[PDB]
Amino acid sequence: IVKRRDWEKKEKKKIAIERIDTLFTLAERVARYSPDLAKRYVELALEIQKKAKVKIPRKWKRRYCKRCHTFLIPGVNARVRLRTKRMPHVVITCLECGYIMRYPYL
Ligand SMILES: [Zn+2]
């Protein structure tokens, strides 16, 4: 039963990650025309993350505003800059609400 429960737990997390990836894919496709819908998809992905206790894929972790949850598109509603005085890092500013997010470049 230990192995069975472990397999089910692992598969459930994989499913959660699969769903999150799909929701962000849809968010990106509808974001430019329907930003409110993209925000909804981002939030559904965040709900799954919370319920399954999983991490958002690397390819999507920086693509939404942690404050307002809008899907971020450089030039449209996001400013992306790099700072290197100390640790090189990416500075992403949500232009819709002004929230600033930083990520390691390396
Ligand atoms: Zn924002």
From Swiss-Prot:
Thermal dependence of function as given in the entry: Optimum temperature is 70 degrees Celsius.
Gene Ontology biological process terms, A to Z: tRNA 5'-leader removal
Pfam families for the chain: Rpr2 (PF04032)
GO cellular component: cytoplasm; ribonuclease P complex
Cofactor(s) the protein needs: Zn(2+)
GO-annotated molecular function: ribonuclease P activity; zinc ion binding
Subcellular location as annotated: Cytoplasm
Enzymatic class: hydrolase
Keywords: Cytoplasm, Endonuclease, Hydrolase, Metal-binding, Nuclease, tRNA processing, Zinc
The record's free-text note on cofactor binding: Binds 1 zinc ion per subunit.
Matching InterPro entries: RNP4, Rpr2/Snm1/Rpp21
Reactions listed under catalytic activity: Endonucleolytic cleavage of RNA, removing 5'-extranucleotides from tRNA precursor
EC number: 3.1.26.5
Superkingdom classification of source: Archaea
Binding site for Zn(2+): 65, 68, 94, 97
HAMAP family reported for this sequence: RNase_P_4
Stored PANTHER family: RIBONUCLEASE P PROTEIN SUBUNIT P21 (PTHR14742:SF0), RIBONUCLEASE P SUBUNIT P21 (PTHR14742)
Role, per record: Part of ribonuclease P, a protein complex that generates mature tRNA molecules by cleaving their 5'-ends. Binds RNase P RNA.
Family, as annotated: Belongs to the eukaryotic/archaeal RNase P protein component 4 family.
Record note on quaternary structure: Consists of a catalytic RNA component and at least 5 protein subunits. Forms a heterodimeric subcomplex with Rnp1. Reconstituted enzyme missing individual protein subunits is suboptimally active, showing each subunit contributes to optimization of activity.
Name assigned to this protein: Ribonuclease P protein component 4
